[PDB]
Amino acid sequence: MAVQISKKRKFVADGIFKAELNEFLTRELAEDGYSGVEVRVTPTRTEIIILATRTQNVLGEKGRRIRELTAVVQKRFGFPEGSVELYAEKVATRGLCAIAQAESLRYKLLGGLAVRRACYGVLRFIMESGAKGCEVVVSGKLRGQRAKSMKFVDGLMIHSGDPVNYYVDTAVRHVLLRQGVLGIKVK
C-alpha cells in the first residue's frame, strides 16, 4: 500500500483495533454472556469471533443482530464490502470466566437478591466447576452511609511472582444502584 506506514505504528493500530473492538462489544453485550474476541487475518477475509454463551440470543431474529454489526464495523474501520465475518461461539467450561460470572452477579444483584446469597451462588458454581481458589471482593455502601468492603475466599491463591500472568484470572465490574455504586473484583 502506498501509505507507506512504518512497523511500530502498525502494531499499535492493530492493538487499538482489538481494544476498541472489546470496549465496544463489552459495553453492549454485557448481559448476554460476553467474554472477549480473538481476530484472525487471512488473504482477504477477517473472522472476528465473539466468545459468548447465549449464541442463539446474540443473533436476534435469525442473524439479524449480527448482520447489523457486520455493516456497522465496516462503516467504522472503513473495511471493504465483505472482508469481515462474525462467528458467535459458546465458551466451554463456563465456570472459569470472570467477566462471564461477573455479569451474572451484576444482574443477580440488580434483581434484588442479597449479597451473602449471591456470593455463595457464584462461589459454589466455581468450586463446582473444578477450580482451586477464588477471591470475590465487593465494595461500596451497604445498608448505611459509611462504606464497607466485603470479601469471600476459599481454596488457594497466589499474589506475587511472574506466574500471575499465566495462572490466575482477574475481573473488575462496576454495578449501579439508585442509592449508590458497588464494585466487584474477582481473582
Binding site: 512497523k7 511500530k8 502498525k10 502494531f11 480473538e38 484472525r40 488473504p43
Partner: protein
C-alpha cells in the same frame, strides 16, 4: 527467481515455529534456500507516572514492547509460494512477500 519473504512478529517461539516450518517444507521439496537470518530486535520505551493525581511519593511505571524481524530469500518460481505462505501460519505473525 528472486523472492524475499519477511517474517516479523512479537511472539518469539511461534515465529520460530513458522520460520522453521517454511524452511523444512522447502527443503523437503528440493529447492535451494538460505539460512534463517536473524535481524536485531527493536524495543519501545514508555515511562509514565503511576498516579492519577499528584499525591504520593513520586513513583514512575514503565512499559516496553519488543519486536523481532526475519527475512528469507529463495531461488524458486512464484506460484507455489501462495501455498507455502499458508501451511500452518500462526496468529500474530506479519508475513511480507516480495517478488521484485
Amino acid at each position: 527467481h528472486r523472492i524475499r519473504i519477511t517474517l516479523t512478529s512479537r511472539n518469539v517461539k511461534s515465529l520460530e515455529k513458522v520460520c522453521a516450518d517454511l524452511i523444512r517444507g522447502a527443503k523437503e521439496k528440493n529447492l535451494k534456500v538460505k539460512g534463517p537470518v536473524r535481524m536485531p530486535t527493536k524495543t519501545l520505551r514508555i515511562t509514565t507516572r503511576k498516579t492519577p493525581c499528584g499525591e504520593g511519593s513520586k513513583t514512575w511505571d514503565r512499559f516496553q514492547m519488543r519486536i523481532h524481524k526475519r527475512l528469507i530469500d529463495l531461488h524458486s518460481p512464484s506460484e507455489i509460494v501462495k501455498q507455502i505462505t499458508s501451511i500452518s501460519i500462526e496468529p500474530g505473525v506479519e508475513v511480507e512477500v516480495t517478488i521484485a
